[PDB]
Amino acid sequence: GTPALDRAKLLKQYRKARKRLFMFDYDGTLTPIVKDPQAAIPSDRVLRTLKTLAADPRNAVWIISGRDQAFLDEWMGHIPELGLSAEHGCFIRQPRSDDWENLAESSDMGWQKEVMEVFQHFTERTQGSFIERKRVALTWHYRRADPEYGAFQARECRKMLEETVAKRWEVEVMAGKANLEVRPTFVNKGFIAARLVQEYGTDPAQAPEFVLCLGDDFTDEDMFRALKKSGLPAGHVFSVTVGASSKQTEASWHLLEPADVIGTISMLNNSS
Ligand SMILES: [Mg+2]
Numbered sequence: 001g002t003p004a005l006d007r008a009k010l011l012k013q014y015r016k017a018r019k020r021l022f023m024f025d026y027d028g029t030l031t032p033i034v035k036d037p038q039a040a041i042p043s044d045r046v047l048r049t050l051k052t053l054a055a056d057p058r059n060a061v062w063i064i065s066g067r068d069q070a071f072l073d074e075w076m077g078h079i080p081e082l083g084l085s086a087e088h089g090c091f092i093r094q095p096r097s098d099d100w101e102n103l104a105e106s107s108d109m110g111w112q113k114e115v116m117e118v119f120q121h122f123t124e125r126t127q128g129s130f131i132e133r134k135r136v137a138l139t140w141h142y143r144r145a146d147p148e149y150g151a152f153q154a155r156e157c158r159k160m161l162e163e164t165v166a167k168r169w170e171v172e173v174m175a176g177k178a179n180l181e182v183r184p185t186f187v188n189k190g191f192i193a194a195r196l197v198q199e200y201g202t203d204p205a206q207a208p209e210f211v212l213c214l215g216d217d218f219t220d221e222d223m224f225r226a227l228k229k230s231g232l233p234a235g236h237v238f239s240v241t242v243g244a245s246s247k248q249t250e251a252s253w254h255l256l257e258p259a260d261v262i263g264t265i266s267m268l269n270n271s272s
Pocket residue numbers: 025026027028029215216217
Protein backbone atom coordinates (compact mmCIF):
# COMPACT_ATOMS: atom_id res chain seq x y z
CA GLY A 1 0.00 0.00 0.00
CA THR A 2 0.98 3.64 -0.50
CA PRO A 3 -0.21 7.08 0.54
CA ALA A 4 -2.05 9.23 -1.99
CA LEU A 5 0.35 11.55 -3.81
CA ASP A 6 0.89 14.61 -1.59
CA ARG A 7 0.20 17.44 -4.06
CA ALA A 8 1.57 20.10 -1.71
CA LYS A 9 4.91 18.30 -1.37
CA LEU A 10 5.00 17.75 -5.16
CA LEU A 11 4.30 21.41 -5.96
CA LYS A 12 6.94 22.66 -3.51
CA GLN A 13 9.75 20.64 -5.06
CA TYR A 14 8.55 21.55 -8.58
CA ARG A 15 8.83 25.25 -7.73
CA LYS A 16 12.26 24.77 -6.13
CA ALA A 17 13.88 22.63 -8.89
CA ARG A 18 15.98 24.31 -11.61
CA LYS A 19 15.53 21.39 -14.03
CA ARG A 20 12.80 18.73 -14.00
CA LEU A 21 12.32 15.27 -15.49
CA PHE A 22 8.98 13.62 -16.23
CA MET A 23 8.67 9.98 -17.27
CA PHE A 24 5.10 8.97 -18.21
CA ASP A 25 3.86 5.54 -19.14
CA TYR A 26 1.10 5.99 -21.75
CA ASP A 27 -1.66 3.32 -21.61
CA GLY A 28 -3.40 3.14 -18.22
CA THR A 29 -1.50 6.18 -16.98
CA LEU A 30 -2.10 9.18 -19.22
CA THR A 31 -5.14 7.60 -20.87
CA PRO A 32 -7.67 5.05 -19.60
CA ILE A 33 -7.60 1.33 -20.39
CA VAL A 34 -10.13 0.66 -23.18
CA LYS A 35 -11.72 -2.30 -24.98
CA ASP A 36 -10.09 -1.59 -28.33
CA PRO A 37 -6.54 -0.33 -28.11
CA GLN A 38 -6.39 1.20 -31.58
CA ALA A 39 -8.84 3.19 -29.62
CA ALA A 40 -6.88 4.98 -26.96
CA ILE A 41 -6.15 7.83 -29.29
CA PRO A 42 -5.29 10.52 -26.79
CA SER A 43 -7.88 13.17 -26.01
CA ASP A 44 -7.31 16.84 -26.78
CA ARG A 45 -7.12 17.42 -23.02
CA VAL A 46 -4.22 14.97 -22.63
CA LEU A 47 -2.36 16.49 -25.62
CA ARG A 48 -2.98 20.05 -24.39
CA THR A 49 -1.79 19.15 -20.90
CA LEU A 50 1.40 17.56 -22.24
CA LYS A 51 2.02 20.40 -24.70
CA THR A 52 1.90 22.96 -21.90
CA LEU A 53 4.13 20.93 -19.60
CA ALA A 54 6.78 20.37 -22.33
CA ALA A 55 6.75 24.03 -23.40
CA ASP A 56 8.69 24.99 -20.23
CA PRO A 57 12.38 24.42 -21.15
CA ARG A 58 13.13 23.59 -17.47
CA ASN A 59 11.09 20.42 -18.13
CA ALA A 60 12.15 17.25 -19.88
CA VAL A 61 8.98 15.35 -20.68
CA TRP A 62 9.12 11.72 -21.79
CA ILE A 63 6.43 9.35 -23.05
CA ILE A 64 7.40 5.72 -22.61
CA SER A 65 5.23 3.21 -24.44
CA GLY A 66 4.96 -0.22 -26.05
CA ARG A 67 3.15 1.45 -28.95
CA ASP A 68 4.67 1.43 -32.41
CA GLN A 69 6.78 4.29 -33.72
CA ALA A 70 3.98 5.11 -36.18
CA PHE A 71 1.45 5.63 -33.36
CA LEU A 72 3.58 7.93 -31.19
CA ASP A 73 4.83 9.76 -34.28
CA GLU A 74 1.31 10.53 -35.47
CA TRP A 75 -0.46 11.36 -32.22
CA MET A 76 2.42 12.76 -30.08
CA GLY A 77 5.13 13.71 -32.55
CA HIS A 78 3.44 16.98 -33.49
CA ILE A 79 4.54 18.22 -30.05
CA PRO A 80 8.26 18.35 -30.82
CA GLU A 81 9.25 19.08 -27.20
CA LEU A 82 8.24 15.55 -26.09
CA GLY A 83 10.83 12.84 -25.78
CA LEU A 84 9.41 9.56 -27.14
CA SER A 85 10.26 5.96 -26.43
CA ALA A 86 8.35 3.52 -28.65
CA GLU A 87 8.15 -0.28 -29.02
CA HIS A 88 9.39 -0.75 -25.46
CA GLY A 89 12.64 1.11 -25.92
CA CYS A 90 13.64 -0.02 -29.43
CA PHE A 91 13.10 3.47 -30.92
CA ILE A 92 13.95 6.72 -29.10
CA ARG A 93 13.39 10.37 -30.11
CA GLN A 94 15.08 13.01 -27.89
CA PRO A 95 13.05 16.13 -27.07
CA ARG A 96 13.27 18.83 -29.79
CA SER A 97 15.03 16.42 -32.09
CA ASP A 98 13.48 15.22 -35.29
CA ASP A 99 15.70 12.25 -35.24
CA TRP A 100 14.57 8.73 -34.24
CA GLU A 101 17.29 6.38 -33.10
CA ASN A 102 17.06 2.63 -33.67
CA LEU A 103 18.63 1.01 -30.63
CA ALA A 104 18.44 -2.46 -32.15
CA GLU A 105 20.64 -1.52 -35.08
CA SER A 106 23.21 0.28 -32.94
CA SER A 107 23.61 -2.52 -30.39
CA ASP A 108 25.41 -5.88 -30.56
CA MET A 109 22.70 -8.31 -31.72
CA GLY A 110 25.09 -11.26 -32.09
CA TRP A 111 23.39 -12.85 -29.09
CA GLN A 112 20.38 -13.87 -31.19
CA LYS A 113 22.27 -16.57 -33.13
CA GLU A 114 23.48 -18.13 -29.85
CA VAL A 115 20.10 -18.00 -28.19
CA MET A 116 18.49 -19.59 -31.30
CA GLU A 117 20.97 -22.45 -31.18
CA VAL A 118 20.24 -23.03 -27.48
CA PHE A 119 16.46 -22.91 -28.02
CA GLN A 120 16.80 -25.30 -31.01
CA HIS A 121 18.57 -27.76 -28.67
CA PHE A 122 15.83 -27.77 -26.08
CA THR A 123 13.10 -27.70 -28.73
CA GLU A 124 14.52 -31.00 -30.03
CA ARG A 125 14.28 -32.41 -26.46
CA THR A 126 10.86 -31.02 -25.60
CA GLN A 127 7.88 -32.20 -27.69
CA GLY A 128 5.22 -29.50 -27.84
CA SER A 129 7.62 -26.58 -27.56
CA PHE A 130 8.47 -24.03 -30.22
CA ILE A 131 10.40 -20.82 -30.83
CA GLU A 132 8.87 -17.38 -31.48
CA ARG A 133 10.97 -14.55 -32.82
CA LYS A 134 9.99 -10.91 -32.49
CA ARG A 135 12.14 -8.06 -33.75
CA VAL A 136 14.33 -7.80 -30.72
CA ALA A 137 13.12 -10.60 -28.40
CA LEU A 138 13.33 -14.42 -28.74
CA THR A 139 10.95 -16.67 -26.85
CA TRP A 140 10.83 -20.39 -26.23
CA HIS A 141 7.27 -21.55 -25.56
CA TYR A 142 6.67 -24.93 -23.87
CA ARG A 143 3.08 -24.76 -22.61
CA ARG A 144 2.24 -27.85 -24.69
CA ALA A 145 4.70 -30.23 -23.01
CA ASP A 146 3.90 -32.03 -19.77
CA PRO A 147 4.24 -29.32 -17.11
CA GLU A 148 6.80 -31.24 -15.01
CA TYR A 149 8.99 -32.29 -17.93
CA GLY A 150 8.59 -28.85 -19.47
CA ALA A 151 9.83 -27.09 -16.33
CA PHE A 152 12.68 -29.60 -16.02
CA GLN A 153 13.95 -28.63 -19.50
CA ALA A 154 13.23 -24.91 -18.88
CA ARG A 155 15.46 -25.02 -15.80
CA GLU A 156 18.29 -26.51 -17.88
CA CYS A 157 17.77 -24.02 -20.71
CA ARG A 158 17.80 -20.97 -18.41
CA LYS A 159 21.01 -22.20 -16.75
CA MET A 160 22.70 -22.65 -20.13
CA LEU A 161 21.61 -19.14 -21.19
CA GLU A 162 22.62 -17.39 -17.94
CA GLU A 163 26.08 -18.94 -17.79
CA THR A 164 27.00 -18.41 -21.45
CA VAL A 165 24.97 -15.87 -23.46
CA ALA A 166 24.06 -13.49 -20.63
CA LYS A 167 27.70 -13.14 -19.60
CA ARG A 168 28.88 -12.16 -23.08
CA TRP A 169 25.96 -9.98 -24.18
CA GLU A 170 23.85 -7.23 -22.60
CA VAL A 171 20.64 -9.25 -22.52
CA GLU A 172 18.20 -10.47 -19.91
CA VAL A 173 16.78 -13.96 -19.49
CA MET A 174 13.13 -13.80 -18.44
CA ALA A 175 10.82 -16.57 -17.30
CA GLY A 176 7.17 -16.12 -18.19
CA LYS A 177 4.31 -18.52 -17.44
CA ALA A 178 5.45 -21.47 -19.54
CA ASN A 179 8.13 -19.76 -21.58
CA LEU A 180 11.64 -18.34 -21.57
CA GLU A 181 12.29 -15.02 -23.27
CA VAL A 182 15.63 -13.39 -24.05
CA ARG A 183 15.75 -9.68 -24.82
CA PRO A 184 18.23 -6.80 -24.78
CA THR A 185 18.45 -4.91 -21.50
CA PHE A 186 17.44 -1.68 -23.32
CA VAL A 187 13.86 -2.97 -23.53
CA ASN A 188 13.52 -2.94 -19.73
CA LYS A 189 11.66 0.19 -18.51
CA GLY A 190 14.06 0.44 -15.55
CA PHE A 191 17.01 0.54 -17.93
CA ILE A 192 15.29 3.36 -19.86
CA ALA A 193 14.59 5.28 -16.65
CA ALA A 194 18.16 4.92 -15.32
CA ARG A 195 19.55 6.00 -18.71
CA LEU A 196 17.40 9.13 -18.84
CA VAL A 197 18.84 10.13 -15.43
CA GLN A 198 22.38 9.18 -16.51
CA GLU A 199 22.12 11.33 -19.68
CA TYR A 200 22.30 14.46 -17.54
CA GLY A 201 25.95 13.63 -17.08
CA THR A 202 28.39 12.97 -14.33
CA ASP A 203 28.25 16.47 -12.86
CA PRO A 204 26.05 16.01 -9.82
CA ALA A 205 25.09 19.72 -10.01
CA GLN A 206 23.52 18.87 -13.36
CA ALA A 207 21.14 16.14 -12.11
CA PRO A 208 17.41 17.10 -12.25
CA GLU A 209 16.11 18.26 -8.88
CA PHE A 210 12.56 17.12 -9.59
CA VAL A 211 11.66 13.73 -11.06
CA LEU A 212 8.07 12.49 -11.53
CA CYS A 213 7.76 8.93 -12.73
CA LEU A 214 4.29 7.50 -13.39
CA GLY A 215 3.00 4.07 -14.47
CA ASP A 216 0.17 1.61 -13.86
CA ASP A 217 1.42 -1.96 -14.08
CA PHE A 218 4.17 -4.45 -13.43
CA THR A 219 6.38 -3.15 -16.29
CA ASP A 220 6.51 0.25 -14.59
CA GLU A 221 7.66 -1.24 -11.28
CA ASP A 222 11.06 -1.56 -12.98
CA MET A 223 11.29 2.23 -13.30
CA PHE A 224 10.36 2.78 -9.65
CA ARG A 225 13.06 0.36 -8.52
CA ALA A 226 15.63 1.91 -10.87
CA LEU A 227 14.98 5.37 -9.40
CA LYS A 228 15.49 4.06 -5.86
CA LYS A 229 19.02 3.07 -6.88
CA SER A 230 19.74 6.22 -8.86
CA GLY A 231 21.52 8.15 -6.14
CA LEU A 232 19.14 11.10 -6.37
CA PRO A 233 18.02 12.66 -3.07
CA ALA A 234 14.76 10.95 -2.06
CA GLY A 235 12.88 14.24 -1.63
CA HIS A 236 13.60 15.08 -5.29
CA VAL A 237 12.01 11.92 -6.70
CA PHE A 238 8.30 11.07 -6.87
CA SER A 239 7.57 7.55 -8.11
CA VAL A 240 3.84 7.18 -8.44
CA THR A 241 1.74 4.13 -9.35
CA VAL A 242 -1.69 4.51 -10.85
CA GLY A 243 -4.03 2.24 -8.94
CA ALA A 244 -5.61 1.52 -5.57
CA SER A 245 -4.29 2.58 -2.16
CA SER A 246 -3.94 -1.13 -1.38
CA LYS A 247 -1.79 -1.93 -4.43
CA GLN A 248 1.60 -3.52 -3.67
CA THR A 249 4.22 -1.48 -5.50
CA GLU A 250 7.79 -0.20 -5.47
CA ALA A 251 6.31 3.29 -5.93
CA SER A 252 6.16 5.70 -2.99
CA TRP A 253 2.77 7.18 -3.90
CA HIS A 254 -0.41 6.41 -5.80
CA LEU A 255 -2.97 8.22 -7.92
CA LEU A 256 -6.25 6.36 -8.40
CA GLU A 257 -6.96 7.02 -12.10
CA PRO A 258 -5.59 8.59 -15.33
CA ALA A 259 -7.97 11.54 -14.73
CA ASP A 260 -6.13 12.20 -11.46
CA VAL A 261 -2.80 12.03 -13.29
CA ILE A 262 -3.93 14.62 -15.82
CA GLY A 263 -5.32 16.68 -12.94
CA THR A 264 -1.95 16.62 -11.15
CA ILE A 265 -0.05 17.72 -14.26
CA SER A 266 -2.60 20.51 -14.80
CA MET A 267 -1.87 21.78 -11.29
CA LEU A 268 1.80 22.00 -12.13
CA ASN A 269 0.96 23.78 -15.41
CA ASN A 270 -1.01 26.35 -13.38
CA SER A 271 1.80 26.87 -10.86
CA SER A 272 2.29 30.53 -11.93
MG1 LIG B 1 0.48 1.27 -18.86
